[PDB]
Swiss-Prot record, chain A:
Subunit annotation: Component of the lid subcomplex of the 19S proteasome regulatory particle complex (also named PA700 complex). The 26S proteasome consists of a 20S proteasome core and two 19S regulatory subunits.
Phenotype upon changing residue 160 to P: In rpn6-2; temperature-sensitive mutant that shows defects in proteasome assembly when incubated at 37 degrees Celsius
Organism encoding this protein: Saccharomyces cerevisiae (strain ATCC 204508 / S288c) (Baker's yeast)
Domain of life: Eukaryota
Domain PCI: from-to ranges: 18-163
Note: Present with 16800 molecules/cell in log phase SD medium.
Protein name per Swiss-Prot or TrEMBL: 26S proteasome regulatory subunit RPN6
Modification after translation: N-acetylated by NAT1.
Function: Component of the lid subcomplex of the 26S proteasome, a multiprotein complex involved in the ATP-dependent degradation of ubiquitinated proteins. In the complex, RPN6 is required for proteasome assembly.
Family assignment from sequence similarity: Belongs to the proteasome subunit S9 family.
From Swiss-Prot, chain B:
Function: Acts as a regulatory subunit of the 26S proteasome which is involved in the ATP-dependent degradation of ubiquitinated proteins.
Pfam family, one: RPN5_C
Family membership noted in the UniProt record: Belongs to the proteasome subunit p55 family.
Species annotation: Saccharomyces cerevisiae (strain ATCC 204508 / S288c)
A biological process from GO: proteasome-mediated ubiquitin-dependent protein catabolic process
Top-level taxon of origin: Eukaryota
Record PTM text: N-acetylated by NAT1.
Stretches assigned to the PCI domain: 222-396
Acetylation among keywords: yes
Protein name in UniProt: 26S proteasome regulatory subunit RPN5
Leftover remarks: Present with 5710 molecules/cell in log phase SD medium.
Keyword terms of this UniProt record: Acetylation, Proteasome
Cellular component GO terms, alphabetical: COP9 signalosome; cytoplasm; proteasome complex; proteasome regulatory particle, lid subcomplex; proteasome storage granule
From Swiss-Prot, chain C:
Span of the entire protein shown here: 258 to 418 of 428
Main function: The 26S proteasome is involved in the ATP-dependent degradation of ubiquitinated proteins. The regulatory (or ATPase) complex confers ATP dependency and substrate specificity to the 26S complex.
Gene encoding the protein: RPT3
Cellular location(s): Cytoplasm; Nucleus
UniProt PTM comment: N-acetylated by NAT3.
Covalent link (Glycyl lysine isopeptide (Lys-Gly) (interchain with G-Cter in ubiquitin)) residue numbers: 23
Similarity comment: family membership: Belongs to the AAA ATPase family.
Stated name of the protein: 26S proteasome regulatory subunit 6B homolog
Curated annotation (Swiss-Prot), chain D:
Gene Ontology biological process terms, A to Z: ERAD pathway; nucleotide-excision repair; positive regulation of RNA polymerase II transcription preinitiation complex assembly; positive regulation of transcription elongation by RNA polymerase II; proteasome regulatory particle assembly; proteasome-mediated ubiquitin-dependent protein catabolic process
Signal peptide: none
Originating gene: RPT4
GO molecular function: ATP binding; ATP hydrolysis activity; proteasome-activating activity; protein domain specific binding; ubiquitin protein ligase binding
Keyword Nucleotide-binding annotated: yes
Protein name: 26S proteasome subunit RPT4
Post-translational modification: N-acetylated by NAT1.
Species whose genome carries this gene: Saccharomyces cerevisiae (strain ATCC 204508 / S288c) (Baker's yeast)
Amino acid sequence: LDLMSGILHCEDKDYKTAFSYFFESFESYHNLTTHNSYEKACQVLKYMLLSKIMLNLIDDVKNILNAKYTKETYQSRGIDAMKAVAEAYNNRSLLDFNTALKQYEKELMGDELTRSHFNALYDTLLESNLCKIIEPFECVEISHISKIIGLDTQQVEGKLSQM
Amino acid sequence: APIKADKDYSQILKEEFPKIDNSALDQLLVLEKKTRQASDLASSKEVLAKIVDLLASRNKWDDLNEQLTLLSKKHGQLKLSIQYMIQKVMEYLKSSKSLDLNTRISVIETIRVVTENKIFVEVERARVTKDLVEIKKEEGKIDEAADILCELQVETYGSMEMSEKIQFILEQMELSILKGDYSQATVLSRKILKKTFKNPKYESLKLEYYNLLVKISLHKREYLEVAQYLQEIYQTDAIKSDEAKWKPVLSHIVYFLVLSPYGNLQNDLIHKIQNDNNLKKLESQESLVKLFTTNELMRWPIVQKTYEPVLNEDDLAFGGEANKHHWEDLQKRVIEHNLRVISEYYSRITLLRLNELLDLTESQTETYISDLVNQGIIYAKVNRPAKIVNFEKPKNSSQLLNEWSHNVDELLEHIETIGHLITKEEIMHGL
Amino acid sequence: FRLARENAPSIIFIDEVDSIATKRFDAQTGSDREVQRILIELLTQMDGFDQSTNVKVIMATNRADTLDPALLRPGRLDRKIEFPSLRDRRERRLIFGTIASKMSLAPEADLDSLIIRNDSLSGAVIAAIMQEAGLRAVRKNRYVILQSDLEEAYATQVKTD
Amino acid sequence: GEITFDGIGGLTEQIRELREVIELPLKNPEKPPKGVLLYGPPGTGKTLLAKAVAATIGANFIFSPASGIVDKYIGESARIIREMFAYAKEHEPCIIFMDEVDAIGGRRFSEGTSADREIQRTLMELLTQMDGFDNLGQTKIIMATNRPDTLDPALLRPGRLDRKVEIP
C-alpha cells in the first residue's frame, strides 16, 4: 500500500507522502526481509530515495544511504545512481547526471519511475546545471555558453528562452 | 567460617595429597557445598580461590576453564568471587599461550567476565578484552577484535574508572582506525576528552587521544578542526613538552591552518605572539600567512619549489602521500587567498591578466571564480564576450544611506571629534 | 486562556478536567459554587469564543460522566479521542520496540516472545513491564535484561494480587 | 526512620524488594520508580516499614495523613501537596508517605459531589504530579493503604504507582 501509495504519490508527487509511505513500507520490508521479494525493499528505498532526491533533500538521502540499517548495508548501481544523481544534483551539472545516468542505467532505467521522472527531473539539471555556475552579461555566445556548460548549441537556444 | 578456614587447611592437605598425586572436588566439595549459591559458612572467596588455584596449578588451564565455567554458573560466593582468580588465570593462561590463548579464547567467551559483561569487574573484563584483542589484532582479527571491544562505554563502566576505560575507549578509537570508522572513536572521543582536562589533566590522556584526535582529524582532513585540535593540546605541550618537540605540531598546525582552505580564527591564529616561534621556520609558514595580504599566484609553483624540506613535502603528521594534500589542497588555497587581495584590488580585469597573474586556464579560473561566485564570497562577472571580469561591487547597497550618513558620520566624527579638541586645545595649550 | 490568545498560537490543556466537571448540582455550599463559575467560565469561554483557532482546548479524561454536554456542545469540544486500542500486538511490538530501544537487555529478552504473551492489555502497564523488568535485572544485579526479567515483570504484571 | 528494616524483619521479602525499587534507583542512574503502595494490616511493622524504609535511604521521610490536606479549608490542594512536593523537591532526598489514602485517595462513590469534587481534585493532584511530568527527583513517595482495592484504578497505574506492596 505505502509502496503503491508512493507509486501514486510519485507521479502527482507529494514525495513526502510517497517517501514516508516508501519509508515505512521499506522499513517493513527492511524487517520483512526475504518474505519481501528481497531487493523490493531497496526498490522501495530507491523510490524512497528518489522521492527525497526528486524532493532533492540529499542529507536524508545520504543519511539514509549512510545509516547501514537504512542502507540495509546494501548497495546497488541505482543506489549510487541516486547518490551520483544527488551529487550531480549538488553539482548543478549537465554531465554529472549523464555520467551516472549512462553508467548506472542498470537499476536506473529498471526503475521506470526514475526512468520516467528523473530523466525529466534531470532536464532541470540543464537549467539546474546552468544556474550551477553563473553568470554572463550584455555579451556572450551560446558557444561560450555551450562550452560554459561544455555542451552543444542546437539544444542551447531552447534552454536560453526557458526563463 | 572457621571450617571455611579449617577444612580448607584440612582439604589443603587433602588436595595437596592428590595435588601431589580428582581432589578437585575435595577442595571444591567443601566450599562447593558450603558457599554454593547459598552461604553455609559462606567462605572467603579465597577458600574457593584456593580451590581454583589448586585446580589451576594442578589441572590444565583447559580443565580449570571448563571447571570455572561450571563453578561460575552455580554462584561463587558472589558474582565477584571466582572471576578474580579467573582473571589471574588470564595472566596464567598467558603464563602459557597459543592453544592456551585458544584455551583463553575458550576461557574468554565461556563467561563474558573476562572480555565482557556479566559482573561489573570491567577493570578486568575490560583488560582481557584488549588482551585477547591484542592477540586478535595479532590474530588479524579486526572487526571482531573491535567488536568484543566495541562495548565498553555502556555494558561496562559507567566510567567507574575512566583512566582504565578511557584507555580502551582510546583503543576502541584505535581499533576504530584499523576499522576506519571515526564514529566508534567519535562518541567515545567527543565524550571523553574534556574529562581528561577535568583529570588532574593528564597530558598522555590528552596526547594519546589528542593524537587519536589528530588521527581522527587525519582521515578527516578538516584542517582548522585538525589544527584546532592540535592547537588545544599544542597549548599543553609547550607546558608539557619543550617548544622544540612541540613546534612540529605548530609547524604543522599553521601548516594545517594553511592546509585548511582558510579559517576566520586562522585569521586570528595568524600572529599568536611568539609564533614564528622564533627559532625554526615555522616562519615561511607565517610568512605565507604574511604572503597572504600580498598573495600573487605567480608565487604558487615558486613557493612550492621554494619550500618542501618538510614544508610542501610532508607525510609526517600530515597524510599528504603526494604533497597534493598540501599542494593541490594548497593550490586552490593560495589561489583562493590570491583571489582575496585580487578581490580587493580589481575593479575590472581581463581573464588573461587574471590567468596571467593567476597562472591558470580559463576554466580553472572560471571555476575558482565560479567557486567563490558559487560561494558568493567574491564578486565577478561571468563574461566570455569581453573575456574580461568586472570584479563588480554591490552598488545597490544604496550606499549614501550609510555613506552620506557616514559623510555625516565624518562630521559626527570630525566636527564632533575635531571640534571638541580645538578650543580646548589652544586653551589646553593656553598661552 | 486569553493569555494563549495573547500568545496565539498556543495550547490549552487540562489534566483530567473532571475535577471541575460537575458543578453544584444542588445547594452545595463551599467550593462547589466556583466549579460552577470556573466551568461556566470555561463553558463561556469555550461556548463563547471565536473560531479562529490559535489555541486548542485539550483535556484528559479517565471518567467522562462527571462532565456535561455543555463541554460536549459542538463548536467547542468537537473531537473526542480515546486512549485505548486493543494494544493490537503491533502496537505492543511498537511499545516493545519502543522501550527496549532505551533499555539494555541480554539475549534472552525477546519482544516477539512477549508479543504473543501480550494481548488485550494497556501500554502504561506495557511501559511498566518493560522497565519493571528493567528493574529486575539490576534487581538481580544483571547488567543485561533477560526474557525471565521480562517474564517476571510480565508475569508479575499480568495480574497484581 | 526510627528502626531499620531489620528490626521488623520477617517482612524480608518486601524489605529487600522495596529497598531495591526505592532506595537503589537513586544510586544507580540505570524509569525511576513512580510509586509504591503498602497494603495489609498497618503498623505490623507495616506503618513502621515506612520509617524502616525511611531509615535506609537517607531521604527525609515526609508523612502524609489525609483529610487535613482538605479539611475545610474549602480548598488548599496542590499548594498543600506541592509544598509537600516542592519542599521535598527542594529538600530531596525526601520520602513521601501518604497514610492509608482512602479519604484523599480512592475512586470515590457515585463519583458525585459530597465535596468529593474536592477529593477528585486532591485525588488528581497526585495524579497530576504523577501522570504529569513531575518526577521523584530525590524525593520518593510511599503510598499507604490497608486495603488496596480501595483505591482509584487510575491511581494504581504505572506512571503513578509502579509497585503494589503486599504485606501478608
